[PDB]
């Protein structure tokens, strides 16, 4: 046989490149996943991830309470934190023993898989009682924030998209929903009658994941890197696996 890495008959090499290219392109096909991660960062350095993976479109919807840090199996002062909730839903509305709950997120990162179309991204960043813009009567139920999403590049490939905002002020008390639609450069509408019921089933079939990792390092190591997910850390370092046309 020919010698490795010297000719056009390195079929092992060609197969490796095709395998990676096939995965990249499968993900972008209408058969493929689109994925959404919402990261809530807490002052103790831990990070809650909410993830949903689904065909056609994907979303996550959280309220003020559900974004709060919960240390499973440890003390969370649940009565005091209910009083925090009461005091955040209406000023002077509760009697907790604290001015600022350390269970409040300090920041949010939203990451989409590379198979999203950024023009379809919508976000409802609402107030603490789940209204998009102060009062329902004046609220558009979402903002289209795609122009703010940064490309996560690795080796010149877009491995995902990130929108990051800090919540450093005392009044940054939010509710949050996010939605994105899978790429569809074809004119075949996946939700027109020929395929519409499959999109309804995709709502059933969407797989969700949630966990609180003790720090960003642990998240990078045992979540992001373990499962070939895109990520952008606090030092603006990019994580992901470039696949298209690559060995
Ligand atoms: N493209 C390129 N890569 C370099 C160069 N010097 C060092 N590198 C390293 O080599 C890596 C790319 O090597 P290859 O993947 O084998 O070459 P390629 O440019 O991708 O071309 P292909 O054979 O089509 O894959 C990069 O990740 C760089 O870190 C250079 O001058 N050009
Ligand atoms: N020293 C080099 N000279 C020429 N081309 C390179 C070199 N290093 C990488 N490249 C090529 O340039 C393209 C972009 O790769 P690069 O490593 O810059 O991507 P990146 O990870 O987005 O970069 P960075 O995160 O450092 O800004 C890739 O196709 C890669 O093969
Ligand atoms: Cl397709
Ligand atoms: Mg009292
Ligand atoms: Mg290469």
TrEMBL record:
Binding-site positions, Mg(2+): 95
Q: Name one GO molecular function term.
A: ATP binding
Q: Where does ATP bind?
A: 155-156
Q: Superkingdom of this entry's organism?
A: Viruses
The protein in question is named Polyhedrin
The alphabetical list of record keywords is: ATP-binding, Metal-binding, Nucleotide-binding
Q: Which organism is it from?
A: Operophtera brumata cypovirus 18
């Amino acid at each position: 046989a020919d010698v490795a890495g010297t000719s056009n008959r390195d079929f092992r090499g060609r197969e490796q490149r095709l395998y990676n290219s096939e995965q990249y392109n499968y993900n972008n096909s209408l058969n493929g996943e689109v994925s959404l991660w919402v990261y809530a960062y807490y002052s103790d350095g831990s990070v809650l991830v909410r993830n949903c993976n689904s065909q056609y479109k994907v979303g996550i919807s959280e309220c003020f309470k559900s974004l709060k840090e919960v240390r499973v199996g440890q003390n969370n002062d649940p009565y005091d934190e209910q009083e925090v909730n009461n005091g955040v839903y209406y000023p002077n509305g509760g009697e907790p023993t604290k001015f600022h709950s350390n269970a409040k997120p300090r920041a949010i990162q939203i990451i989409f898989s590379p198979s999203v179309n950024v023009h379809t991204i919508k976000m409802a960043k609402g107030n603490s009682v789940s209204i998009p813009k102060d009062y329902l009567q004046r609220s558009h139920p979402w903002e289209a924030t795609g122009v703010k999403y940064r490309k996560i590049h690795v080796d010149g490939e877009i491995v995902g998209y990130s929108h990051y905002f800090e919540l450093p002020h005392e009044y940054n008390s939010i509710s949050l929903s996010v939605s994105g639609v899978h790429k569809n450069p074809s004119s075949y509408n996946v939700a027109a009658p020929h395929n519409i019921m499959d999109v309804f089933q995709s709502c059933d079939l969407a797989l969700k994941f949630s966990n609180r990792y003790w720090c960003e390092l642990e998240l990078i190591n045992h979540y992001i890197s373990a499962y070939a997910y895109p990520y952008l850390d606090i030092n603006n370092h990019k994580y992901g696996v470039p696949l298209n046309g690559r060995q």
